[PDB]
Design a protein around this nucleic acid. Structure first.
Length: 324
DNA sequence: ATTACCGGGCTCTGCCATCTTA
DNA sequence: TAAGATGGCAGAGCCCGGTAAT
């Protein structure tokens, strides 16, 4: 009824909220006012609250008992209200897209029993909140699948493989198994990878690779192959390269290319680059910036030791002084 | 004194499709 | 019989510095 009037004064973007969830507005009763007070209660700015309601209107259909309970459960993981408020601003949907607090609490219990610690749970909640709106079964599925792969490979105790992979890759429990499986079969195929190496890779330097959408790695890698073949690198050199620094897969196609090009526009050979993969850690912006400083001081670059382009500001700025 | 090796920090959606639900 | 509740999906890097090595 007076719904819209409320929202409007709250700062809500109604037109957008209607597009997202028309249903919420065909509701006789809604608790948009209790919500405002609750979030105001817990530190939330007036503008955050508007923003949160504008992205997930169904949030206003929650009761103060319900909100206070779920909030309280989050506080079993995170230590401050501020932490929580920030997670909610970044990702409203994780807090509000379920009202099933028993599941949440069973979810938390389960995650503990899998041998995860609180520090790890706080890390999931912080960096992959959507985990805690996952159904218990869902988190079960993923965890079970990881154990059943910890075993399908050399690994002794999956109950520890699982912990490693999560510390490294918190967002894992909010990937589908369709996705994660496809990413393993991809690394396994693409690099004729034994059971153990593949294992190490996936817990370590290539952990995030499992988070890529369908065909994203196949496509990103394909492009790496093409871009490096075009410059006289053999397949082996390409593979040695990516395996030595798998995260280069995560880069979007054009960023990898743009990145290679700026480097070579300077007489930096492709040999220099692939033998020092980490120089690609830098943003193009940072590279370019440094490249200027260094061509300025009469550096060559074709003959320089370019590992410095990816050194911390501290160790880079220092070496630069000396070059004057 | 100076570089290499290598792993850690930080990482936190927003939309649609398909069920349940009451 | 129309909402809620759930699952799934496209999208995709940069910087730091402890410590071994020279």
């Amino acid at each position: 009824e007076d719904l819209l009037k409320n929202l409007l004064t709250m700062g809500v973007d109604i037109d957008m909220a209607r597009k997202r969830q028309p249903g919420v507005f065909h509701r006789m009763i809604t608790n948009e006012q209790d919500l405002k007070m609750f979030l105001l209660s817990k530190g939330a700015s007036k503008e955050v609250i508007a923003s949160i309601i504008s992205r997930y209107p169904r949030a206003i259909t929650r009761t103060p008992e319900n909100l206070s309970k779920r909030w309280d459960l989050w506080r079993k993981i995170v230590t401050s209200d501020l932490e929580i408020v920030n997670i909610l601003e970044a990702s409203p949907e994780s807090f509000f897209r379920s009202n099933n607090n028993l599941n949440l609490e069973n979810n938390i219990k389960f995650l503990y029993s899998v041998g995860l610690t609180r520090k790890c749970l706080c890390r999931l909640l912080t960096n992959a909140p959507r985990t805690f709106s996952n159904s218990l079964d869902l988190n079960k599925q993923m965890v079970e699948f990881l154990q059943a792969a910890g075993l399908s490979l050399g690994h002794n105790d999956p109950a520890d493989f699982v912990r490693k992979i999560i510390f490294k890759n918190p967002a894992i429990l909010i990937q589908s198994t369709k996705r994660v499986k496809a990413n393993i079969e991809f690394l396994r195929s693409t690099f004729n990878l034994n059971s153990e190496e593949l294992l190490v890779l996936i817990c370590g330097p290539g952990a995030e690779i499992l988070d890529l959408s369908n065909d994203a790695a196949r496509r990103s890698y394909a492009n790496i192959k093409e871009k490096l073949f075009s410059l006289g690198c053999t397949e082996e050199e390409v593979q040695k390269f990516v395996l030595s620094y798998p995260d280069v897969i995560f880069l979007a196609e054009k960023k990898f290319n743009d990145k290679i090009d700026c480097l070579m526009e300077e007489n930096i050979s492709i040999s220099q680059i692939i033998e020092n993969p980490r120089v690609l850690d830098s943003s193009i912006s940072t590279l370019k910036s440094r490249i200027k400083e260094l061509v300025n001081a009469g550096c060559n670059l074709s003959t320089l030791n370019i590992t410095l382009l990816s050194w911390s500001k501290k160790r880079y700025e220092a070496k630069l002084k000396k070059l004057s």
